[PDB]
Amino acid sequence: QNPVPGTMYELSQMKNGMRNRRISSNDPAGGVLDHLSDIRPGEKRIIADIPGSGIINHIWITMAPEPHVLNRSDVIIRMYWDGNAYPSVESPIGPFFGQGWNERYNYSALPITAGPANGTSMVSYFSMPFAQGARIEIENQSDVNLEKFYFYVDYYETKKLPTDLGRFHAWYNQELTEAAPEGETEWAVIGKQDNNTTGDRNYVFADIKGKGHFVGLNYYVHCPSPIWYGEGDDFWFIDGEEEASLLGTGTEDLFNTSWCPKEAYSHPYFGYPRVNNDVGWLGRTHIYRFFIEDPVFFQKSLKASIEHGHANNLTLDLATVAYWYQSEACPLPPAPSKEVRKLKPFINVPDMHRWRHEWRKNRGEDSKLWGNEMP
Amino acid sequence: QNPVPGTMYELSQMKNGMRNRRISSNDPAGGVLDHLSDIRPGEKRIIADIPGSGIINHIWITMAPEPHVLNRSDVIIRMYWDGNAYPSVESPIGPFFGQGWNERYNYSALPITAGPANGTSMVSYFSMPFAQGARIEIENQSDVNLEKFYFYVDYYETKKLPTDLGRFHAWYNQELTEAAPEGETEWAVIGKQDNNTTGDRNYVFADIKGKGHFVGLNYYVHCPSPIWYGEGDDFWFIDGEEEASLLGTGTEDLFNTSWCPKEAYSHPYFGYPRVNNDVGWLGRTHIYRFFIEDPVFFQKSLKASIEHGHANNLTLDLATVAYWYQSEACPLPPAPSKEVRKLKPFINVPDMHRWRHEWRKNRGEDSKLWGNEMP
Amino acid sequence: QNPVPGTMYELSQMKNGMRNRRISSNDPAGGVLDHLSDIRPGEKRIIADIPGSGIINHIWITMAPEPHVLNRSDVIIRMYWDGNAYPSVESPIGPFFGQGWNERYNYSALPITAGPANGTSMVSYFSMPFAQGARIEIENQSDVNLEKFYFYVDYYETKKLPTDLGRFHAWYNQELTEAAPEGETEWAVIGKQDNNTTGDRNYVFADIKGKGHFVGLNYYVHCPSPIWYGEGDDFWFIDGEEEASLLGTGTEDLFNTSWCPKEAYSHPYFGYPRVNNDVGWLGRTHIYRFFIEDPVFFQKSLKASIEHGHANNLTLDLATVAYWYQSEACPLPPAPSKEVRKLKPFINVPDMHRWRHEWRKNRGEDSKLWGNEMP
Amino acid sequence: QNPVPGTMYELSQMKNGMRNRRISSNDPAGGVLDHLSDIRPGEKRIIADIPGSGIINHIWITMAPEPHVLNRSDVIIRMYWDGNAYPSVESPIGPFFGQGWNERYNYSALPITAGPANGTSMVSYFSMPFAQGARIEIENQSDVNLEKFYFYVDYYETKKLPTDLGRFHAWYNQELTEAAPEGETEWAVIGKQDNNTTGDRNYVFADIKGKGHFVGLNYYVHCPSPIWYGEGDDFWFIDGEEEASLLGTGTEDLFNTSWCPKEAYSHPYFGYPRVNNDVGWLGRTHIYRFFIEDPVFFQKSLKASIEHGHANNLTLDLATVAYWYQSEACPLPPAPSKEVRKLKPFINVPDMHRWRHEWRKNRGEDSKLWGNEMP
Amino acid sequence: QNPVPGTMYELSQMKNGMRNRRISSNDPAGGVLDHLSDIRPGEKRIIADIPGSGIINHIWITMAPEPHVLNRSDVIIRMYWDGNAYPSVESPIGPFFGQGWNERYNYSALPITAGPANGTSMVSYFSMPFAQGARIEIENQSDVNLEKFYFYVDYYETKKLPTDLGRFHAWYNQELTEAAPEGETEWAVIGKQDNNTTGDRNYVFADIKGKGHFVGLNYYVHCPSPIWYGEGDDFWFIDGEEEASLLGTGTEDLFNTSWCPKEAYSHPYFGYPRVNNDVGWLGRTHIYRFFIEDPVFFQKSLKASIEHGHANNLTLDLATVAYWYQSEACPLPPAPSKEVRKLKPFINVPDMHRWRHEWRKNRGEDSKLWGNEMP
Ligand SMILES: [Ca+2]
Ligand SMILES: [Ca+2]
Ligand SMILES: [Ca+2]
Ligand SMILES: [Ca+2]
Ligand SMILES: [Ca+2]
Ligand SMILES: [Ca+2]
Ligand SMILES: [Ca+2]
Ligand SMILES: [Ca+2]
Ligand SMILES: [Ca+2]
Ligand SMILES: [Ca+2]
Ligand SMILES: [Ca+2]
Ligand SMILES: [Ca+2]
Ligand SMILES: [Ca+2]
Ligand SMILES: [Ca+2]
Ligand SMILES: [Ca+2]
Ligand SMILES: [Ca+2]
Ligand SMILES: [Ca+2]
């Protein structure tokens, strides 16, 4: 046991057994073509195919053209461990690296981040062990050529993988959520709110069978109302228990924040790298939390979900990437279709004036209705 | 005729006939009570009662308590010329000095402005001639004591008023405007737009009988929709003509601006000292234009109006102060009641979510309605 | 021993023995009451009472009403381990989470932080082991109802606590410090400065008996002079030694800064989240340092103190929270009274003009004294 | 009489009788030496010597080295009209152009301003008629060489001066004012305040014998207290009257502002181009007002003064430039000495801590005096 | 093995074997002289001489006078372990602590940083083990007295060093790089670009013989062209291999960024604390990356280099500090001379206009050459 607790002490210890390697897009002829080229629409490219045992320790990727031209929500990254035919990592590449939608922004989370120039640099420091090979694949599901693909995949080669190491998994999910039958009753603004004791209509962000521990969540909400999107509670069902053993209080609360915030904020383990910047909470918000000091263990299964509004009353376009380890390389739930991933239009001024018009009709159309009158 | 055209040349000319005087709140005992005190709710106070002939050349006023406590839209200033029983100036004092609602903000218009600290200083450089007396009265129509009232009324005394001088007038008007029977059809967003060839349902900001010329407009809109409030055209009917001889194209256009602006901006003769700072054009905007180089003359009458939205389709809380001169001191149209002047609540997040709810009902309540769908 | 030094490698290792649990304010009926309610003035509430062995891994708390209404320096958090009657954690809750006084501000320290909305979210990632129970109690020592109390207490349950784990302690102290008898001689501005070879009149921020290691300090100074508050040296007496084995050079210096800074600054392990923003160093400053890579070990005792100005010459309102581990759960020194914790008024303009007046008297009252003259 | 009231109409009128001329520092050899050179310490230079009748219509000046090297409060400008031996304009050149002390800042007053780069451009649009010559002289009373002096003096030549034109005057005054014998009783902070019914101890900014009208004031205060400097009332004695016919209420009030402002602000006729930017009102403030629409006429004399604090209780370093016209070219009051114009040091942190020390002594030196305690 | 992966769990573990010690500049007489004094030009001072076995866990240093007076690139820090005559750490002190050139700026890297006031505080959290002594020496190679030197060197004393600990090394290198013989062909702007398959003309930032691992790089570029400086690839030759096993794609790419960024950015492990802030990439840039989770291991040797522009085509003033551990204390490569470390002048406006002039000559000197014309 170390006599001093931190990483800096550990970094001064001599180590054995690991040899650095790097798969990169370096031009082998010595020239300027230090990128892969022309991953056309509909095409897949294996960017790294590593035999044997090792541990990925760092990934850096960037792409051309820019995010406003090539939608990073339509370029997919997949990773396959141990010669499995199924991926244990499957996500749109932007969302995997904490870049929502087709947008770009710098931030500074510890294990995964996007950096300069203005969010085009995609960086991961998650450790990704493998015993019998690793393959990383990129698929262009956009309608634009992926002109240039630059990358480093840094890894340690070893003769024998330490026997206690697991396998990295990540899964993108997305749903346009269903409003409650009585309507969007958030904050009791339109009427009485229901209870939700079961979690049955929650939005699911992980559904895992096996042994492991949960380490991260990137949450992307596109809210089509000005109302606060985040009253919904997190539910974690560990090991098939009937009642969730971890129950939360709200969505900002899960992300270590409070009172319906909409301010950009950075901590190594949690933050808001993109906030809506409009009336109320209308538009897009990205929130992250990494569970590095505080991973969620499970021995047999984990199903983790969150209400979409209090008792699932709201329509939200919700997407998530969940990150976790398992004792072996396991398959994932189904991927959302390209259709589910289609970007939604921002609710705009003509749209809201149309709301106002239907509201005036239903309030009886007095020619001096202000906009706040109750029935 | 002067050989050089500007004011600076004129300022170097020796003048005769005018003696400076000042009515002020200076403490005659020499002390610190350099203000009037305790103009209680419901009370009137004559602050200046000047006999004979003169010309007001400068007014400065400030009040305690601050604008968030004492509503400057409920403290009224009136001015009476030539011993008339009727006022030729009647307005809430904030709006007269280009401070809308109960708000405060510095700006820099040439003839009338509000200045530091943060809009509490109220300044006028309009020249206000009178032959047989001047009286300035303040009335507290608020529910708060007017604790301190500081002022300078600077004027020139003369033995005989120059015979070509007119008389300053100003009038506050306000209306919560009526939406069109087919609804608020602005931008053709909800349906087809009507024509308005008559101007009959326009918002009126001046209705003057006599000879004179129009010199200013302060325009205060509280828009309860996100839609652009300003498509409405100005109409000026001079001298009883059946068809308006001056017709405009839009409200920003009248104020020397273009394309639905919502940015703070200052020119000596026109500007936006308070902009809505919210989604679309929802909330409050103050616009001014002074007609100093370009006054609007009339010999018999002027009726000046503006559409409230294209063809008067919108509900807006509109208030205006109009400024003008006439050949003699004339009465004004009726004052809006204290009830018409009541501040309207800002349209808020619960309000708009209630709009959305009525819209969902009328679009058929599919549980995944986004918010943009058409019938 | 791990072949790779950091946390990311460790996070990819499979673990056994720990089961996640969470005590939270989730509404068990399924509804919106996801908070405790109405902890009235003078009342105590047990928010978590955990039997047996475990490790707290994460705490999140927020409260209503807001910090300008409910003083977070008057709501106390206490933690009791191993069925002890005495607390091993005792502090006002704001200061515990790095929110001084009755103020609010976001910051980003690694182990403890306050986050959005504007400092209302209170977060701890300190690990807090216990073998025979844990109890967390909140006491409302304010004059305002604690209306809503939201929380997550995330912990690992275990059948048997690892035998090398200690116990988390934290202690709030506060003192209005005594100026030196010859006056506040800082910087030799008023006269000669004394020596301090003993540390006897220092401000004490830890006084611990037992085995353990020191891990953090939150320092809150309210300085009633414009002079620099921070010339005072830190003294650490380990294991009853007569002469302190760790001696510092200044207060900014202890906090890894230099030359009397007053700029907001964030590093994971040290920073200034609230700076005085006034003339010189007048007003309030919050500084933190966490000793994560560099804990201060002790086997028998630690007494740690800092001069309040060079050789304890200054009157300062100083408050601190100290954080540490011990080999077992131990009691704390006495808590400051509610009276010691009373907020001090900011030194204001009338106050300083009164200083100037006494200065003029003592310099002989020449009618043109500028303010810099020496005797 | 013109049928349209403004300058723009007048500018479209053809004029006769005036021929443009310009005295400038243009290099007559065609080269780059488009400046005067080397006006050494103690030296005077005539920059313009114009025979006969004309009207100065525009002056632009700039100097090297920069204001932090060559003190523009120690370079004097003088103007002599009609072959008089005495100047009718006498001021330090910075203060004349609205640049206080040895500082530099852009602003935008209408008749006189300082402009880019950062206040080095000095501009006047005052009209300055003369019948029998004009001479403009610069004197370097600084200890630094005036290396380069660039200028345009634009004027109209005429065969016969219009007989109604006056003559431009300006006078710099400065005083370190005397505190009241009972001390600086401003705001009644230290004790009871006196009355001032006479104006006898006021600071005088104009003392004029003759016929004319007053057109401007630049006011420069260096306040050595944090207290508000500006409670003092303006007094104007016209034509030898025993009681001042124009009495004000406060200093900000005279400058068309209210409630002790300290924010930068620009209107054509009044403003704050330099504010103190420190605790309370400690340090330097520059305020201006031009009386262009509202000149103060006098037939025989004008003496204009302002209290230095309420009833002249404060010590302030006050300096002013007053601007006016008279019917003929007249001499000025005495100039302040170079000694009176010496820059005062800013009151600093050691100074105020010394105040605090004398205050502690007089309050009895309890070791926990906070700083607000009363006797 | 720990059941929970992070540092926070480890921090709650009781430890044995380590006793805190601190060498500091504390005044032993009790007074204000809490600094070393007067390290004159050409002088060396041992600031810490520790016998026996221990581990440095934290260093804080600050110096007077300020960085614009005393060039921190000319004050050298050296560290000697285990009684060796050669240093294993040798660098200019500013660059060692991530302060380039003679500049100052706050930043927030995890293991080494510069903090308030504005970059004067120099902080290291690298662990530095030693078995048979440690000596830290400062040498003043500047032409200015080092007036005050404040420091803490915090370390753990131990009876026996853990046998797996290595030794900290760091080395400053600098080169004014050679342009390619065909000219600076970056981006193919002036002509065809060459290949570089060997790395022979690369800029070398580490050249190490022994066993260990690489942990950091501070990179300082002064680019005398507006062109992007950073197309050059990193090459790492491990254990004497003929072909580099780690090959990169670009300089921003190595630093976890993309697309020629020039924006200030902070992540714990990489960032841009000083960017050029001028046309293109002209001037100075500082970039850092720490390899904490992802150290580069080597058993026999490491030579690490980077192209200076694509295929070493550019002239750059490049300086680096490299940080690493070895199994024992080893000597370093030669230090750059004081002459190599001389600050280069910023390319300025006269310089670039001279470029333009030579360009006009070579393009044939048409009098209307714009500046973009090709031959
Ligand atoms: Ca570790
Ligand atoms: Ca290459
Ligand atoms: Ca659902
Ligand atoms: Ca909830
Ligand atoms: Ca005119
Ligand atoms: Ca008075
Ligand atoms: Ca109407
Ligand atoms: Ca129109
Ligand atoms: Ca709930
Ligand atoms: Ca003490
Ligand atoms: Ca000290
Ligand atoms: Ca020339
Ligand atoms: Ca006096
Ligand atoms: Ca007064
Ligand atoms: Ca000391
Ligand atoms: Ca080379
Ligand atoms: Ca390259």
Automatic annotation (TrEMBL), chains A, B, C, D, E:
Organism from which the protein derives: Dysgonomonas gadei ATCC BAA-286
Q: Where does Ca(2+) 3 bind?
A: 34, 231, 233, 249
Record's keyword terms, sorted: Calcium, Metal-binding, Signal
Task: Name the positions where Ca(2+) 1 binds.
Answer: 10
Any idea which positions bind Ca(2+) 4? Answer: 201, 308
Q: Which residues bind Ca(2+) 2?
A: 31, 34, 233
The protein's matches in Pfam families, at most eight in alphabetical order, are given as: DUF2961 (PF11175)
Does rRNA-binding appear among the keywords? no
Q: Which GO molecular-function terms appear in the entry? A: metal ion binding
Q: What is this protein called?
A: DUF2961 domain-containing protein
Q: Which InterPro entries match?
A: DUF2961
